[PDB]
Coordinates of C-alpha atoms and ligand atoms in Angstrom, one line a residue:
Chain A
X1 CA 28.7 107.1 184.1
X2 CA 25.5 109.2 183.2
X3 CA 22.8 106.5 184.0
X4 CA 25.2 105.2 186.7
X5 CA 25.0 108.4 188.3
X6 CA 21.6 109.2 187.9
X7 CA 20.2 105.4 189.6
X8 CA 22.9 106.6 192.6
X9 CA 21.4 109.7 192.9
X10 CA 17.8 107.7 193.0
X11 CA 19.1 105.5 195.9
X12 CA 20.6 108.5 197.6
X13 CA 16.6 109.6 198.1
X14 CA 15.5 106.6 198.8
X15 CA 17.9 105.8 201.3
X16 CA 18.2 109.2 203.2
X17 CA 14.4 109.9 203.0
X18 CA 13.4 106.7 204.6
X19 CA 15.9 107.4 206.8
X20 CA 17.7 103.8 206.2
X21 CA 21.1 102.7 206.7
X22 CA 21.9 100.8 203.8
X23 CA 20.1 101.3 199.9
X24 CA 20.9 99.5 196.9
X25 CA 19.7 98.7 193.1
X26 CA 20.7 96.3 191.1
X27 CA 19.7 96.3 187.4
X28 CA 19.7 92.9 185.4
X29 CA 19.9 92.3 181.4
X30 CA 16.6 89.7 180.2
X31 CA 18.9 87.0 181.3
X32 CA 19.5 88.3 184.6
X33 CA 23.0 89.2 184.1
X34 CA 23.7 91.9 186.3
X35 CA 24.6 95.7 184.4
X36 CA 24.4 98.1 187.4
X37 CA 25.2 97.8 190.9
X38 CA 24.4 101.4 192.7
X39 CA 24.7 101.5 196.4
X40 CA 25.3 103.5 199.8
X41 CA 26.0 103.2 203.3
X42 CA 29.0 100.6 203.2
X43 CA 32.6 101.4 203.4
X44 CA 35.4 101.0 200.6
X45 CA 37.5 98.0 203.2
X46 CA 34.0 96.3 203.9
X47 CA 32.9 96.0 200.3
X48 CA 36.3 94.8 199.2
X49 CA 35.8 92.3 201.9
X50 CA 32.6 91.1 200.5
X51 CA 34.5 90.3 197.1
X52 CA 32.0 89.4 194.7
X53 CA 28.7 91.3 193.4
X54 CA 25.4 89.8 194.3
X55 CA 24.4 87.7 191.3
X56 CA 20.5 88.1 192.2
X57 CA 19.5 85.4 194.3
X58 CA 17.5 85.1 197.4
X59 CA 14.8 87.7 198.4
X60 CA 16.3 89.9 195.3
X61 CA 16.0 86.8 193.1
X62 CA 12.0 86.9 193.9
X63 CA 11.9 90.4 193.5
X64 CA 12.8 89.7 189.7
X65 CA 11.1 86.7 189.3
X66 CA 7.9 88.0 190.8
X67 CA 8.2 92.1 190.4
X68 CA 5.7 93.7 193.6
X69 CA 6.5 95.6 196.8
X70 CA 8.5 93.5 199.0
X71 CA 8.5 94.2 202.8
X72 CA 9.9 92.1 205.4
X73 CA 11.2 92.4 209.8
X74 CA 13.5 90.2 208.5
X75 CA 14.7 89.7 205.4
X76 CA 16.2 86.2 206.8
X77 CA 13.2 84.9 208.2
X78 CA 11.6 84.5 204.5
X79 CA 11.2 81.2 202.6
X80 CA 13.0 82.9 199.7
X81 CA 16.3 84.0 201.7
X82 CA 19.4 82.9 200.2
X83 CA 21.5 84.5 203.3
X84 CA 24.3 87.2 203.3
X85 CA 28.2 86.3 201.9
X86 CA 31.0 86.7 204.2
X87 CA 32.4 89.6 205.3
X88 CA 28.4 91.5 204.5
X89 CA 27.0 93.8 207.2
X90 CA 24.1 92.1 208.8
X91 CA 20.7 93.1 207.9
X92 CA 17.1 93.0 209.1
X93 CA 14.5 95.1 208.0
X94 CA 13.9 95.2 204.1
X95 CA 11.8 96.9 201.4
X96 CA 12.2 96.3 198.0
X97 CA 10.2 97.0 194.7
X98 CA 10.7 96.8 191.2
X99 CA 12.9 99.6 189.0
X100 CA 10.1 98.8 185.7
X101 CA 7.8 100.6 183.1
X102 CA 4.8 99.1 182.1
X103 CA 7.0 97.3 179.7
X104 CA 9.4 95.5 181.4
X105 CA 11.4 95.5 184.3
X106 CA 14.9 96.1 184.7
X107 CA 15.9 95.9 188.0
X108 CA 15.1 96.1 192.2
X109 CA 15.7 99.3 194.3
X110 CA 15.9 98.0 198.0
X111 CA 16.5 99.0 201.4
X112 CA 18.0 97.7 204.9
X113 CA 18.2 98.4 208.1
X114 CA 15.5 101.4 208.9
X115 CA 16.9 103.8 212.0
X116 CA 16.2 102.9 214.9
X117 CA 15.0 99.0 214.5
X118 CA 11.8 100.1 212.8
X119 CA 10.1 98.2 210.3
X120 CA 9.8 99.8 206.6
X121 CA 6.2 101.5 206.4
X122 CA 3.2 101.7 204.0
X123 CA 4.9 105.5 203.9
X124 CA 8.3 104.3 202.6
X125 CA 6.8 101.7 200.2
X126 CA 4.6 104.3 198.8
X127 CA 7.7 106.9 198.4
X128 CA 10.4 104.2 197.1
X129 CA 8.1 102.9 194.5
X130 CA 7.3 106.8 193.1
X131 CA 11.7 107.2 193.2
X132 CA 11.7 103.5 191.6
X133 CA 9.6 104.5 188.6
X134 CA 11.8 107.3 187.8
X135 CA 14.2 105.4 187.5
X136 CA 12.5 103.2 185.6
X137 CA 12.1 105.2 182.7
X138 CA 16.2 106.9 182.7
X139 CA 16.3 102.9 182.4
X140 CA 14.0 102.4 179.4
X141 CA 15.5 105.4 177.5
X142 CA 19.6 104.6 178.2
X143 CA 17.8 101.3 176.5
X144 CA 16.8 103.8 173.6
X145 CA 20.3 105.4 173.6
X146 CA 21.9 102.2 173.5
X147 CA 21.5 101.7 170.6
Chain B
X1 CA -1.6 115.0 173.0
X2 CA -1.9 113.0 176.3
X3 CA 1.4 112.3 178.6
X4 CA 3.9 109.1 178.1
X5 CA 1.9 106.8 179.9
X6 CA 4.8 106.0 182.2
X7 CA 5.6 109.4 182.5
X8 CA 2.1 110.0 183.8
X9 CA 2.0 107.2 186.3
X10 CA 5.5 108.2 187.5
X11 CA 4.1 112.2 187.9
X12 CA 1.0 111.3 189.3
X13 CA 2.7 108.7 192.3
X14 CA 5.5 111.2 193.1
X15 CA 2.4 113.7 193.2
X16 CA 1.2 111.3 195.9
X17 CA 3.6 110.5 197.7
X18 CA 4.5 114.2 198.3
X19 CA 0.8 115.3 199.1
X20 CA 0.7 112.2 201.4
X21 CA 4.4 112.4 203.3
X22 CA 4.3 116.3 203.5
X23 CA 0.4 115.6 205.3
X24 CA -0.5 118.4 202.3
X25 CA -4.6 118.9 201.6
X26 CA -3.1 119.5 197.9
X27 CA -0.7 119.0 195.6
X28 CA 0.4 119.7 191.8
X29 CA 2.5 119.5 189.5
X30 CA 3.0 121.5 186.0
X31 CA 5.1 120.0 182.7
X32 CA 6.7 122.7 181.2
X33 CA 8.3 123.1 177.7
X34 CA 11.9 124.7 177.5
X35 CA 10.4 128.1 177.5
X36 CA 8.3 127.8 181.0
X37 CA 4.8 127.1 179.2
X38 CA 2.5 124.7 180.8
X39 CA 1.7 121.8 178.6
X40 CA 0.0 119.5 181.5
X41 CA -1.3 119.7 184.7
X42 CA -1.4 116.8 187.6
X43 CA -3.0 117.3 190.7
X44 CA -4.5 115.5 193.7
X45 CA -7.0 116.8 196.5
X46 CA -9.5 118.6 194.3
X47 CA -12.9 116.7 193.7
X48 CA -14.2 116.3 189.9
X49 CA -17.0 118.4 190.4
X50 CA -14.7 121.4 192.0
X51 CA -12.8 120.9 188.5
X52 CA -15.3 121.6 186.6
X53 CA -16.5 124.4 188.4
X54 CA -13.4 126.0 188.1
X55 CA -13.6 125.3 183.9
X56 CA -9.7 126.3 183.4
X57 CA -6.4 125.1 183.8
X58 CA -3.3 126.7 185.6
X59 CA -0.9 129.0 183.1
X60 CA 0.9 129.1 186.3
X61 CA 1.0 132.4 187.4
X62 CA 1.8 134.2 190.2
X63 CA 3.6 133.0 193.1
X64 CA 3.7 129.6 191.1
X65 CA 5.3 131.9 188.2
X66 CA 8.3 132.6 191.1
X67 CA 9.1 128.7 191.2
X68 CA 10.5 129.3 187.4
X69 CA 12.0 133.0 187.6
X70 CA 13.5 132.3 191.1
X71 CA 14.6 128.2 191.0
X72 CA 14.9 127.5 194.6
X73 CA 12.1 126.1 197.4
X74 CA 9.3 128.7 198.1
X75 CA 7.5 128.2 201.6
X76 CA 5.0 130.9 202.5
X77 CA 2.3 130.8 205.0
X78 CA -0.2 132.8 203.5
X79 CA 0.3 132.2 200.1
X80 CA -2.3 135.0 198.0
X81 CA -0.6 138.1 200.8
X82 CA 2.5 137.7 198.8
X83 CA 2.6 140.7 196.3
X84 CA 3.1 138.5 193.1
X85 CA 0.2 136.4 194.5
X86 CA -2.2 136.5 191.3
X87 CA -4.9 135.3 193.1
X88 CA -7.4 132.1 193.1
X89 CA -10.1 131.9 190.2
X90 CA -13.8 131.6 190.7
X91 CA -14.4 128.4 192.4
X92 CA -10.8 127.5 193.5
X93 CA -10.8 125.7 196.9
X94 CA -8.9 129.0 199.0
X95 CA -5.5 127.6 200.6
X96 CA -3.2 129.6 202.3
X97 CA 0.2 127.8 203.5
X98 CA 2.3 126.9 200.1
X99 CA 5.5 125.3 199.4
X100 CA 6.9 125.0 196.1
X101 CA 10.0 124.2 194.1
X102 CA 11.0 124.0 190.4
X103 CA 11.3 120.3 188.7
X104 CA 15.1 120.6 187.5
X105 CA 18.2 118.1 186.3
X106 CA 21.1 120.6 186.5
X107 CA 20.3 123.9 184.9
X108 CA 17.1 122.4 182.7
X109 CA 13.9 123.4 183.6
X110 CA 11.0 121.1 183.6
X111 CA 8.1 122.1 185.2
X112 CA 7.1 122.6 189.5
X113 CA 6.4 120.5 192.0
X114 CA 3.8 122.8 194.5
X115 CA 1.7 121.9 197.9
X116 CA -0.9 124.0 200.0
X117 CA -2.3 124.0 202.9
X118 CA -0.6 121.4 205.1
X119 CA -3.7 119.2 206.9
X120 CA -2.4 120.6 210.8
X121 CA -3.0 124.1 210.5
X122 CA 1.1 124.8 210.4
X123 CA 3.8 125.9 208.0
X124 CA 5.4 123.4 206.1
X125 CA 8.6 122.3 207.3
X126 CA 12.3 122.4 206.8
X127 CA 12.2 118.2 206.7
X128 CA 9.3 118.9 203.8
X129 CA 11.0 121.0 201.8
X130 CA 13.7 118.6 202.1
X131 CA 11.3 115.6 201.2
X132 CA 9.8 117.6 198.0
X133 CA 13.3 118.9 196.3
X134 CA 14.3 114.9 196.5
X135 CA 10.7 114.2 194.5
X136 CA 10.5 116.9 192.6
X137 CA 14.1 116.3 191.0
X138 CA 13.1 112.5 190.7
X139 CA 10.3 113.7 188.5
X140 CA 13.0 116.2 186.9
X141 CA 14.8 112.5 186.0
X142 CA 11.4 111.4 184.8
X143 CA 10.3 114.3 182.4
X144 CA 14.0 114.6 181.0
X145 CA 14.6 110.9 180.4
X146 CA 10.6 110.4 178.7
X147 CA 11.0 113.6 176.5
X148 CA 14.9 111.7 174.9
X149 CA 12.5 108.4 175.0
X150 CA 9.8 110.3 172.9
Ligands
LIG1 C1 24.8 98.6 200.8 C2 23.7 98.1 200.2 C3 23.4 96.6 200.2 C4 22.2 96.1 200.5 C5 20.9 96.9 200.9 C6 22.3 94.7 200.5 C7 21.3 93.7 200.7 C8 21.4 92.4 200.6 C9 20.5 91.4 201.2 C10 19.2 91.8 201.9 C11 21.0 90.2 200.9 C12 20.4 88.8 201.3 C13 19.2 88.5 200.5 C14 18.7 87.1 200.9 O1 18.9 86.6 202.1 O2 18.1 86.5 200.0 C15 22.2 90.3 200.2 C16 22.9 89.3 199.7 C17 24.1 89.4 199.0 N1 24.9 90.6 198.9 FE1 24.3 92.5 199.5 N2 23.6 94.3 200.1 C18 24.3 95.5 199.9 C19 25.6 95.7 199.5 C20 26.4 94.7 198.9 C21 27.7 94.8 198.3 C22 28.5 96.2 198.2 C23 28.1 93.6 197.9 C24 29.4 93.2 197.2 C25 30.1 94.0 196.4 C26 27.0 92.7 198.2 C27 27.0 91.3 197.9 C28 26.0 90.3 198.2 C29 26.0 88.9 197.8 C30 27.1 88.2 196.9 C31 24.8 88.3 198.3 C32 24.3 86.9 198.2 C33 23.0 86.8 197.2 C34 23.3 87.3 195.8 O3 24.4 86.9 195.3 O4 22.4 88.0 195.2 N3 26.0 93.4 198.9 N4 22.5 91.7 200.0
LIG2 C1 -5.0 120.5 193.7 C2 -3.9 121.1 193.7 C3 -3.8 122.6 193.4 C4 -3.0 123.4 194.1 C5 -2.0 123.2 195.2 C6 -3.2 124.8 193.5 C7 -2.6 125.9 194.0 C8 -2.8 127.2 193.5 C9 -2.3 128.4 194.1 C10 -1.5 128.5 195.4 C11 -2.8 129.4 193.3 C12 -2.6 131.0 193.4 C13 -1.2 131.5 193.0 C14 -1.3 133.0 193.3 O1 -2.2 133.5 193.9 O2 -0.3 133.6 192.8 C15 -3.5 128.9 192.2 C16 -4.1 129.6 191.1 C17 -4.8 129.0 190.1 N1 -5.3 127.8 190.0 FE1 -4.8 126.2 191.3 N2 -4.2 124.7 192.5 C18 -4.6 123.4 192.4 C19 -5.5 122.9 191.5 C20 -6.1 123.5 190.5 C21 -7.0 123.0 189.5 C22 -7.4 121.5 189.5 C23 -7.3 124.0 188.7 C24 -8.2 124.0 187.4 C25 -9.1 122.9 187.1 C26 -6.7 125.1 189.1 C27 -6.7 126.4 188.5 C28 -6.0 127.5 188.8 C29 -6.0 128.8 188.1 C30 -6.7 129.0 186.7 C31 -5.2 129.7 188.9 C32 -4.9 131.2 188.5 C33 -3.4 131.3 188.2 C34 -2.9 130.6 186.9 O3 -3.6 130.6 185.9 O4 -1.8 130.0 187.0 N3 -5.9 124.9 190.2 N4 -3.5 127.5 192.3
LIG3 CA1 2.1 112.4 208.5

């Protein structure tokens, strides 16, 4: 899954409505263990390629360490970039913010690969962050539920 | 009482961000009970001063009152023609194009999600509609998920 399918369904929006090609959340446990990996726009073959989850690191590892809007051209070209696994699709453009309540935060709802070549917008920030919050709280409450 | 404050941030951003991506002079959004009654009221494009003029709340009547009897997007282009149109009260800016759409997870009824007068002139669009049933089942997830938290 119910949660599962509810942070899919939040990445679904975000990814379609900023018109990206690739969305993603990940959502951690306080010790950074990751509970929830949710994403679109990558084939069944290509992910199994990939092998392994993303544990956090890089540009995502900031995002957790230090939860704000994160927009980049070039998600390589930043200090923090850890660098894609084999097999991954290449990616450029990236905007990322935190999944959170005013409580805590539980994870990172990100983006790749706008249509088009265009970088991420003030627009798309704006509108990713307002899906991120709802998820947010169906994060805090599962929390509740559990147990 | 007041709203969750995370629930209220959460309303009030995807408030913005549909006002804001739609190009919308206004936009609202009502909190219902299971029973369609209003218990709060967001809204963004109306100064302080025009609030108080106006010196009530929405009970959400009228065309807004279709959003919850009819649960799919409304998009008119003269909104107060329409013959369920209950009409603005003293004091209420006048708007005329309108779209709306309930705030739902599955068959659950939460609230609406409603914006007027697009800043161009011209009817809302297909791609707007679009944009607001995406937000206004994102605040669906909101409502639904604080209320179990409450
Ligand atoms: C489709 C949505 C996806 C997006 C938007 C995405 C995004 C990213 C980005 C931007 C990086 C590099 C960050 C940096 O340089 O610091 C990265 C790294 C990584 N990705 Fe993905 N990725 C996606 C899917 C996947 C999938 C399906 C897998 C595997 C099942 C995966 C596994 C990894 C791994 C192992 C890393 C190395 C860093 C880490 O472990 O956190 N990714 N991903
Ligand atoms: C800023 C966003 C707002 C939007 C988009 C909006 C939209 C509308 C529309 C389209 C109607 C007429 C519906 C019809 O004729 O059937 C209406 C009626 C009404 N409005 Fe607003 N309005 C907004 C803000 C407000 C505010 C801030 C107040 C009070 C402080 C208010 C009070 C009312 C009242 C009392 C009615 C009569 C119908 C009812 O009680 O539901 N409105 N609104
Ligand atoms: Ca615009």
């Amino acid at each position: 899954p119910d949660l599962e399918a509810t942070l899919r369904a939040i990445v679904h929006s975000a990814t379609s409505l900023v018109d990206a090609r690739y969305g993603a959340m990940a959502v951690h446990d306080r010790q950074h263990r990751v509970l929830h990996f949710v994403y679109e726009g990558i084939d069944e073959e290509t992910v199994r390629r990939i092998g392994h989850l993303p544990k956090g690191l890089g540009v995502i590892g900031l995002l957790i360490e230090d939860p704000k809007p994160l927009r980049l051209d070039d998600v390589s070209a930043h200090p923090a970039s850890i660098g894609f696994p084999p097999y991954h699709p290449p990616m450029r453009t990236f905007l990322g913010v935190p999944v959170r309540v005013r409580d805590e935060s539980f994870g990172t709802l990100y983006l790749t690969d706008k249509t088009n070549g265009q970088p991420f917008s003030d627009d798309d920030e704006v509108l990713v962050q307002a899906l991120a919050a709802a998820a947010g709280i169906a994060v805090a409450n599962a929390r509740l539920y559990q147990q």
